[PDB]
Amino acid sequence: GRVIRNQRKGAGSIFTSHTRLRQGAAKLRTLDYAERHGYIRGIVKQIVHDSGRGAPLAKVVFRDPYKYRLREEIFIANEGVHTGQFIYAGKKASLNVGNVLPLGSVPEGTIVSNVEEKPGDRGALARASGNYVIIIGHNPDENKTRVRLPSGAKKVISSDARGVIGVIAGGGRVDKPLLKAGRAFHKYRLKRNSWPKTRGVAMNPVDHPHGGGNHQHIGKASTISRGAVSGQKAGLIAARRTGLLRGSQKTQ
Amino acid sequence: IYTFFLKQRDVTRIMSACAQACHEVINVMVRKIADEFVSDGVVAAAGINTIREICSRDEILLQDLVEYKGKGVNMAAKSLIALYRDVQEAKKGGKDIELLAKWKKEDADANWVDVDSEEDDVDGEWVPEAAFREIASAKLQELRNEESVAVDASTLTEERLQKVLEG
RNA sequence: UUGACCUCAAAUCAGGUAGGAGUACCCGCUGAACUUAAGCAUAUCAAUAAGCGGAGGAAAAGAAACCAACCGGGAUUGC
RNA sequence: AUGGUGAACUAUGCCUGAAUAGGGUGAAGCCAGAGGAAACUCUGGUGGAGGCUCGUAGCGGUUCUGACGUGCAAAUCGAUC
RNA sequence: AGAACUGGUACGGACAAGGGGAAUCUGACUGUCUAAUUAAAACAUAGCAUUGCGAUGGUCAGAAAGUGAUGUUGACGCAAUGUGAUUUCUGCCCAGUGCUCUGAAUGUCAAAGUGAAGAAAUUCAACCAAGCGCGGGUAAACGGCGGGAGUAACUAUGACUCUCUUAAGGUAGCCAAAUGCCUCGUCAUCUAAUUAGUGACGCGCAUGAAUGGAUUAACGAGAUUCCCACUGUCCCUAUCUA
RNA sequence: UUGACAUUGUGAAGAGACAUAGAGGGUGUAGAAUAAGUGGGAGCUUCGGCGCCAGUGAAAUACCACUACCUUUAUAGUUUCUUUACUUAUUCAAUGAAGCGGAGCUGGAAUUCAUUUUCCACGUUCUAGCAUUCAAGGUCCCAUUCGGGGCUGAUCCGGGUUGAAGACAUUGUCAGGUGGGGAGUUUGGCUGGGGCGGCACAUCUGUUAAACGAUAACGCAGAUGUCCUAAGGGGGGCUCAUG
RNA sequence: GUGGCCUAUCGAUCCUUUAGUCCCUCGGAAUUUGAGGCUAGAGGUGCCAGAAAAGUUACCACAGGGAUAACUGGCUUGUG
Structure with missing residues (x-):
């Protein structure tokens, strides 16, 4: 009867x-012939702060x-633009600062925004993709793209997305x-509650x-x-290592 | 068990032996992994070698990267170091604690690959500067091409990390 | 540059149908514990208590792919 | 064990309201005066910041181990913190 | 705020209202619960660390699904533990008990399928998946912690020797050099001369208690000890009012 | 969590090991040899070949057999093995199927073999200044109408429209293995209550048995649940040890 | 003269496995194997016809007792 939290x-x-x-979500509206390979323009004016954390909307x-x-x-808004600046992202045009292009029409170093991982579709039924433009280099080989993050994982997916270049003060x-x-x-009255993480050498004795x-x-x-x-299932799950990461890097 | 025991004279002996021996397949990949691991612990070059290796490319090729993510930057620093060097103690101490000042007080010899040995020998006997300022940090680029115009082939043809390498 | 049969729909009309209470007895489906125990499980209690739905005015079952090895047998249930 | 039925008090989360004596101490920034070659070092006002100090109601019930307990009260009154 | 007069040497005259200072151990302060014996050294909050995490993945709940939350989130956020302000915060080890396992797969491995005898039934040799075995990582998750080796036994005793943070009579350095005012004074070096420079010792006005055998401000309804002021509790009995 | 059949079609499918039998090599010193660890040496159709033919010498050459098989083929077939397109069954974000792919009246860039047999084309890209009403324009109609009705503008096929994937995945009865979340069951007595872990009590020696102490086991190698293949029965003779 | 002058001269049932009779069972007549009987061994108990259980909890309540039913020291030791 005595469960754990x-x-x-x-x-x-x-x-x-x-x-x-x-207020609302963050997924884009209806997709058409524009919001993909061809010509897609975005806007940004009232940069109202994202409620709950540190981000612009x-x-x-x-x-x-x-x-x-x-x-x-x-x-989702970005940092670097003023009160009003349209997006200059044309596949048949060029490229500037703060543009929205797929992960195939651009070379290395392209941090776009998060919206979808599938070849467009107004919020792909999935989401196991990137968190937004946050992406370094890509892959010229076909429509494939090999992304990489310092978190410690790899992923090879498509090269189409609707993410705009920009940064967030996080x-x-x-x-x-x-x-x-x-x-x-x-x-964490935000979305739920998950910050009691919670002890007691005698929290529940005749048990532990x-x-x-x-x-x-x-x-x-x-x-x-x-x-x-x-x-x-109370505590660590599927352990492997344990050490102390120092501040001094300079590794291979 | 190689690296295992590996952690002497006969060491490097049979060392280089099975060394060049063992010299695609990441089973052996991660093997050599933990290998050079405990290695540096107590390769290296070959270390970051297989490094960028998996680079291109759960478990044990993954926790390895995790740890390696928390000579590189150290290289650059001690680079300028040995730089003015051949061109010491204080520099090393600054780049390095109570024992830092303990040192601060052939000893340092045994103390402490090829580069290191060479430097030590030179210093004992005496008991690219553009590259220098360069790795150090544009004005730099300036003096750069400066002395620049001022194996030249592969020469003109970070990247400078690889450069110091060849040097 | 043009009309039929079949399938799939949409109302407030003449003419019809559906949703439950009581509920002895009886029927179909699903599903427990306690008592006894030359210790415990199997087993007994128990195709059970309680609860729900439908049909009937008795219900279920029954006019034979049934019952025998004898003098061949002549529908179901109950005492 | 099986078959049913509750959130007026207490505890947790979301949404919608009301209410909360008087002070000392005076943090950044700004102003004036004085010293200094520069990066600056102080005092005297204004501003009154803070999971802060003292002290009512509300909240809370540790000490004075009282009175009461054949139930003043199915857990209280007064005083103190 | 300063300058007078006067009385009982009187003066926030009643009522409100922190008695105070100096230590040790534990513990940061503030907040919350034990309706009705326990208000504490517990939990929680800042900091740090570990495990898990690419959507065709995982966690929680349910009899099941095309039900729900996490999820108005995208490595910056998301779920589960321990530690609980800063300085302080392992010296070494991975053979055992767990977890993880893209390392290693035919020793062992049901049924179905397949293979003999057999007009049948039962029994029925081999093949294969998973688990178990081996190995590595992981002990801020649980141990060990006068440690870890090499030595005529094939495994069974662990002396002797070696390395190390395994050593009982308290001698840490520097010190006319920017730190020495006294001082243009002594010694030594250069010079015709040089109050400036360099090199020892001594008593250094104002430098430092490296390292080693168990370290702390402020705050307080936790506990123990001591001092001052005050006090009819006691010594040692009694009287007044509602 | 894992596996077979079925759900669930089709056989143009790259490369192995088998379920009955007949050849192919059995090469270490020496013997010109194929003498393969061991066994078998009076023999099978008898007119005839070798039966033990010569030198050497641990083993000497037909003969129904426990045999390790270097490399192939093999009749109706074979449980699980990567695989591009075409998939009338499952699930599926939006759904006001929104301007799409192939093909098709046309430019430019790239260089030559007779022409389009291939690859980017197909409404915004300095500014919260501006944007819609069967699109501003042409041809064809009830006549001179302040409106309305085709085509082109905006041509079709496809009906799987911009996006994951596929005879994939999920459900049900199928050896056993991970797991006190939950339920049921389980506590003679045994250090004057109880209070570590194991349960190695009785056969001569060695071994069994991890060494100066102990140490069981109807387990292993002779004997052994004591002894006897005349130490029995019977006749005659003899009359013991020690001092 | 059915042993040693006298004294010593024993391997439960159930379950499983094996051997023996041509009989029994063969329960739709009859026929061919057939798990279960009778007799006779081995093995799994030397508690005398020779059969005994499981080893974690001072976080609560009800029904009890003067032989605390609970079987000779788990501590000190009289006249030295």
């Missing part, structure tokens, strides 16, 4: 919509070619310690399968197997 997401209450503060509203309507669509926010503390509730009793010491390995039991 890893098996909670099955009530639909304290895990539901908790983000009044925000723009009121990218396109005059619908199919019908006289200008539905307000809050999309670097430094996590590099600068939460000095003036008082952050946990309003911290890990190891505790009456003294600060564990017993069993906190490395719970992935395919073994879904009733003991």
Whole structure:
């Protein structure tokens, strides 16, 4: 009967919509002949800050070619542009600063925005692709593209996307310690809650399968197997290494 | 077990032996991986070699990269180092702790490949500057082409890291 | 540059149909624990208690791919 | 074990409201005066910042181990913190 | 704010209201729960570390799916533990107990299928997937921590010797050099002369307690000890009012 | 989590090892030899070849057999093996199928073999200044109408439209292995309660058995659940040890 | 003269496996194997016709007891 606080997401209450503060999504509108190989132009004016974190959002509203309507669509903005600057991204034209081109019509060094990973389709039924323009070099070989990130993974996919060049002031926010503390509730009153990460040498005594009793010491390995039991998964999963990464790089 | 024991005189002996021996398939790939691993621990060049190798290209080719992501930059620095060198202690200490000042106080010899040995020997006996300022840091590019015009083939034909390499 | 048959639909009309309570008894489907136990499981309790749906005015079953080795047998259920 | 039925008090999450005595200490920035070749070093005002100090209601119930407990109260009153 | 007069040597006259200073161990302060014996040295919050993570992947919940949250997220964010302010924060080791496993696959490996005898049934030799075995990484996840080797036994004792952070009488350095005012004073070197420069020692006004045998401000309803002021608790009994 | 059949079609499918039998080499010193660790040496159709023919010498050459098989083929076939397009069945983001692919009236760039047998084309790209109403224009109609009706502008096929993939994946009965999330079951007595782990009590020696102490086992190699192939029965004779 | 002058002179059932009779079972007549009987061995218990269980919990409540049913020291030791 006494469960652990890893098996909670099955009530639909304290895990539901908790983000009044925000507005809309970020996925683009209807795709046509324009928003792909040929000619695609974007806009950015009211750079309203992204609610919940540190990012900009723009009121990218396109005059619908199919019908006289200008539905307000809050999309992701970028840093470097002022209050109003149209995108100059033409496949049959050229390239400048802050443009939107597929991952095939551009050479190495192309950090676009995130929207989709599939050859376009207004939010591909998937998403296991890139997080946006954030991409270095590509691959001239056919329509394939080999991306790479310092996270430690590889991926080979297509070379078509609707991401625009631009940056977001996020670097430094996590590099600068939460000095003036008082952050946990309003911290992750954002979308849900996942910041209690939470201890007790005697949190649940006549139990602790890990190891505790009456003294600060564990017993069993906190490395719970992935395919073994879904009733003991409390702590590390599928361990391999453990060390200390120093600041001095200069490696191979 | 090679690198295993590997961690003497007879070492380098049978060393270079099976060395050139073992000298595509990443089983052996990651093997040599952990190899040079414990290696540097206690190749290197061949190290970052197989490095950029997997570079082009779960487990154990992956955690390796993770650790290697947290001579390169060190190379550049100690580069200018040996630079003014042949051209010391203080420099090394600055590039390097209480024992930093401990040193600060052939000793340093045993202390401490080819480059290193050469430098040491030269210093004991005495007991491209453009490249210098270059790797150091445009005005640099300036003095660069300056002395520039001022194997020349492969010469004119980072990249300078590879350059120092050939040098 | 032009009309039929079949399949697939759409109302407020003449003429029809559907959604449940009580519920002895009976029928189809699914599904527990306690008692006893020369210790424990198997097994008994138990094709059960409780709950739900449909049909009938009795229900289920029954006018033979059934019952015998004898003097051949002559529909179902119950005492 | 099987068959059913609840969120007015308590605890957690989202949304919609109301309310919260008087002070000391005076952090960045800005102004004036003085010293210095420069990158500057101080005092005296204004501004009143902060998971801060003292102190009511609200919140909270640790100490004075009282009174009361054949139930003043199915867990209280006064005082203090 | 300063300058007078006067009384009981009186003066925030009642009411409100921090008694205070100096240590050790533990512990950062603030916030929350034990409705009704336990308000603490617990948990939480800042910092740091580890595991997992490319959407045709994983975690949670459900009898199942074309149900839900995580997910208005894209390595900057997302789920699960431990540690719980900064300085401090392993010296070494991976044979055992786990996890991971694109390392290693025919020793062992059901049924179906396939192969003999057989007018049949039962039994039924070999092949193959997965798990188990071997190996590596991982001990800020649990151990070990006067350590790790080489030595006439084929494995069984671990002396002796060697390396290291395994050593009982407290001698860390520097010190007329920018740090020496006293000082244009002594010694030594150059010079016709040079109060400036260089090189020792000594008592250095104002330099430093490297390294080593268990380190702390401010804050406080945690606990122990001591001092001052004050105090009819006691010594040692009694009286007044609602 | 894994595997076979079926769901679920088709056989133009690159490269191996088998399920009955007949040849091919059996080459280490010496013997000109194929004397392959061991066994078999009076023999099978008898007129006839070798039966033990010569030199050497540990093994001497037909003969129904335990045999390690270097490299092939093999009749109706073969459980699992990468594979480009065409797929009437499953799932599927948008859905107001939005301007698409091939082909097709046409330029430019690239150089020559007789012409288009191939590859980028097919409405915005300095500014929150501006943008729509069966598009501004032509031909064909009820007549002189302030409107309306075709074609071209915007030609078709395809009906799988801009985007993942495929006879893929998911469901159900199928040896066993990962797992106290949950349920059920389980606690004689045994250091005057109870309180480490194991459960190595009784056969001469060695071994069994990880060394100066112990140490079981109806386990292994003689004997052994004591002894006897006359130490029995019977007649005659003899009358023991020690001092 | 059915042994040694006297004294010593024993291997449960059930389950599984094997051998023996041409009989029994063969339950739709009859026929060919056939798991289960009778008799006779081996093996799995030397508690005398010779059969005993499992080894984690001071986080609660109800029904009890003066022989705490619970079997000779798990500590000190009288006249030295």
